[PDB]
Write a protein that binds this ligand. Structure first.
Ligand SMILES: O=P(O)(O)OC[C@H]1O[C@H](O)[C@H](O)[C@@H](O)[C@@H]1O
Lengths: 556, 556
């Protein structure tokens, strides 16, 4: 595997072995009054600032230099330039990787197979803009002559998580827009509970699927169409109530939607990088096309920051390198995303797909099996909720857990003259300070002494009250969570993921690991029908099927 | 540390070192046709069946025997009896641990300080019943004389997660009940967006907190009171719209709440074990007291199973033991909970608190620091959604991740003559089969050959298409997700957590690790107010505060 054979990596690992035990965050800060200044980036986007403070990490000047040299030796800059120029860097599928084209506001040509993609990107955006105007204005009418009140996105994974997360995060920008609903699970609860609250006369369905063959999405779409036709009783009315977002015109036609009712995207748009494309239609419908364009513009700003900045001062590069340090040198399995923002409640779930489906890989570009760790398990809940759930384990468990804490300076709801946001900010700051500093036995002893505890009760309680500290965090703070800033943040993590994949020599852009489960499910489907025993699998699968058939008709 | 010095543990570890590399799930099933039969428990509760199939784990007869022996020699049987009898097993706080008393339907006396707690448990339950009749019938009137249509639970952590997860899971049982809302985050978005959808005339607030001084909860509660009084304009009207789940009589009275409308619980009720207490009021209001009683009865059934069953066939003990094997022998940091049920969408988040805040610990009963791992990081999303987000990494990444797959046989929504549920079940079954079996080079090769790939393309793609398999799972299948069965499931995991804590020699029932962040936040809060530079912390905390003070003025 290319990483472990790399001499710059071996140097880093050797240094970690010899010296890492001596790194103490409390002491790093005491020895260096300039530590924050030297280990943070303050990015002025001209539409707000993003501060990436990486000073509370187990690093020094030497470590950062070694990490930057490693990025250089792994060819990160050339790989990046190849992505942006439309090279077919998705080598297992022989595809370009061009989510950066979707938000290329500059309109500089990007060629695939000698042909500029920007005219077709811009054509679809124009069509999206026109459609959003028609629906949001009340002009677009349903089959009984009423304006649309509800938009229902039907899709799963990449066709669900982005639009859901973004509409949730940008909820204050949705005033006067139609309601949005997301249906994703094949579990019939999902579509049933949604349809229960809706009228066929005023509901517009958006069928979102790159392939247009995904079982959950097509089944859900068929159920929706059946519910719709039971009321409308007119096949021609489908064109007023269903729109398709796909690359696969043939399958869209087969489902019963005309290409005029389809907004297209392309094979070089990965599903988990797709919200910037036609897949973002439900975002644009909910918040308006203007705000959708600002989302794209913010991503574009971050794209240019990634493209043009020297590695040592490049935000997604530094984030990627810190992650490699913890993954490949410290062996940490996980990475927590902890946004102190209730609107961002689905941000961590989004990056579960974005990170884990990209970099949860084990074969390199050479065909070699990796002999090192690749992508981490991503998880998290918004602050302050998480503090009262799982921070006990972060402070006093036995796992090292790199955390990114995120927060806007300005709240969308400055209620009680700012009291709530003041408290929120205080907790944001205090938690990373606590994780860094800890509490020494001598400090805990004095607290117990002052609390009026007896020598007997004191000694029994003391060790439980000690915080070992030295737990590293990033703090990412931004002026306000606007559409533009959100776009910049999402793109920043997209590029972090890219940099890590290149350093591991894996393909961040394929997903062969989902195929086997789909195949085995198609085999089991027919076996569930009827009351005969199944014997064709291992004894567990067979036994679970027996239980299902036995318990099917028990009237509880 | 006790565990590492235990001879049964050292034997298990030595066996792992010598033999674990040769455990292959495919081979284990091939060699033993009785495997499912001998490595599963089919529990008949008389109100449905719960099948705990642990056969797809990296264990054999000898391993389970070694594991059960370790549980015995770590004192699991004696510790359990001590919990059930009211012994003060929460040893750092000198407290009993009696969530089992809350649902003790048998009413067998359980004594704390020589006094039976059951009369008081039953009195509060009776008051809850009365409250439910009043609100649900429409007899409880708001300040303008109208029936209540909306219930708002205000609370954090254990005062929020349980009621939220259970009302979400039991949504079908809520017919005729008032709508329920949960406000928890201090982030003012949470209360603001909730109150915007509400009428002061028809909304009832439930303030959930032991001390009635918890900062986030009391601040949110005070904001709700202010909004209410803007419309009502009469301090005496508060008593018709605010109730408390608390013991602090004076504070509740000062708030304006009729002390009649305070429902009590006790210090032996841990927050993360509290939904079974007065804290469950919002559940009982939403689905009715009868269904709440069914929830308690399900937990009671599992309590009796845990208490009376020999270890080798005791469901929560076996789950705990498999966890110890993966944590302390294989070194797996995480445990995934994957319910194939949209109604269970908050189940994993609930057990983040239940598990991580319980067992994210590092000091043993003797005061010594553990020299072994304790509680895992718990995470997950409902199936099938997770398949399209992160299962790529579970199948083809570099992490070993024990997963529990959960599903009901019968759906609450059998739409399209059961087609959706048939598909859901097929995926549930197929994913654990896939994780176990993988896909061999010989199988992938035939697929590439059929696809018409060239010799060169076949060779290059082949390793990317192989699934190594040997990834262990539990499958937990149950007749239907009723209130009773849900209660049984929650209690099962409560007791799994308890068993692991005993084996690690830690206190599952305190939470000293949340204290430091609370102290540091209280110090920072007043520092944010004015314009002056803050220099009293480390340079990162100071620099982050400087950025906040500079950016809060910026106009975008
Ligand atoms: O957009 P679709 O063609 O319906 O595919 C949706 C999804 O399904 C798959 O399982 C893959 O995990 C993803 O890459 C994707 O987001």
């Amino acid at each position: 595997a290319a990483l472990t054979r790399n001499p710059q990596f071996q140097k880093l690992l050797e240094w970690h072995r010899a010296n890492s035990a001596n790194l103490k965050l409390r002491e790093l800060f005491e020895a260096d009054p300039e530590r924050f200044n030297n280990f943070s980036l303050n990015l002025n986007t001209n539409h707000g600032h993003i501060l990436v403070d990486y000073s509370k990490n187990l690093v020094n000047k030497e470590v950062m230099q070694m990490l930057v040299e490693l990025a250089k030796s792994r060819g990160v800059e050339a790989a990046r330039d190849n992505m942006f120029s439309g090279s077919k860097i998705n080598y297992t599928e022989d595809r370009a990787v061009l989510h950066v084209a979707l938000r290329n506001r500059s309109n500089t040509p990007i060629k695939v197979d000698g042909k500029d993609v920007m005219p077709e990107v811009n054509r679809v955006l124009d069509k999206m803009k026109s459609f959003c105007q028609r629906v949001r204005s009340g002009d677009w009418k349903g089959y009984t002559g009423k304006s649309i009140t509800d938009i229902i996105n039907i899709g799963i994974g990449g066709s669900d998580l982005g639009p859901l997360m973004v509409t949730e995060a940008l909820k204050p920008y949705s005033k006067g827009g139609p309601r949005v609903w997301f249906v994703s699970n094949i579990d019939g609860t999902h579509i049933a509970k949604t349809l229960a609250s809706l009228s066929p006369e005023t509901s517009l369905f958006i069928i979102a699927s790159k392939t247009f063959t995904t079982q959950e999405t097509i089944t859900n779409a068929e159920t929706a169409k059946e519910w719709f036709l039971e009321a409308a009783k007119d096949p021609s009315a489908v064109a007023k109530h269903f729109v398709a977002l796909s690359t696969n015109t043939a399958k869209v036609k087969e489902f019963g939607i005309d290409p005029q009712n389809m907004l297209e995207f392309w094979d070089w748009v990965g599903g988990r990088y797709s919200l910037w494309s036609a897949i973002g239609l439900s975002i644009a419908l909910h918040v308006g096309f203007d705000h959708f364009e600002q989302l794209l513009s913010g991503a574009h700003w971050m794209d240019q920051h990634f493209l043009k900045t020297p590695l040592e001062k490049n935000a997604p590069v530094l984030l990627a390198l810190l992650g490699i340090w913890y993954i490949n040198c410290y062996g940490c399995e996980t990475h927590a995303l902890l946004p102190y923002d209730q609107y961002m409640h689905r941000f961590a779930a989004y990056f579960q797909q974005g990170d884990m489906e990209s970099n949860g890989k084990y074969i390199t570009k050479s065909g070699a099996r990796v002999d090192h760790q690749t992508g981490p398990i991503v998880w998290g809940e918004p602050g302050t909720n998480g503090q009262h759930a799982f921070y006990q384990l972060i402070h006093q468990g036995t796992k090292m857990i790199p955390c990114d804490f995120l927060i806007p300076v300005q709240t969308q709801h400055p209620i009680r003259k700012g009291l709530h946001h003041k408290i929120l900010l205080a907790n944001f700051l205090a938690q990373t300070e606590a994780l860094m500093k800890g509490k020494l036995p001598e400090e805990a002893r004095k607290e117990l002494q002052a609390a009026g505890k007896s020598p007997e009760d004191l000694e029994k309680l003391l060790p439980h009250k000690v915080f070992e500290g030295n737990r590293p965090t990033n703090s990412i703070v931004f002026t306000k969570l606007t559409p533009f800033i959100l776009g910049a943040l999402i793109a920043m993590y997209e590029h972090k993921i890219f940099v890590q994949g290149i350093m591991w020599d894996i393909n961040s852009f394929d997903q062969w690991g989902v195929e086997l489960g789909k195949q085995l499910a198609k085999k089991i489907e027919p076996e569930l029908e009827g009351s005969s025993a199944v014997t064709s699998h291992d004894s567990s699968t067979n036994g679970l099927i027996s239980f299902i058939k036995q318990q099917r008709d028990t009237k509880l």
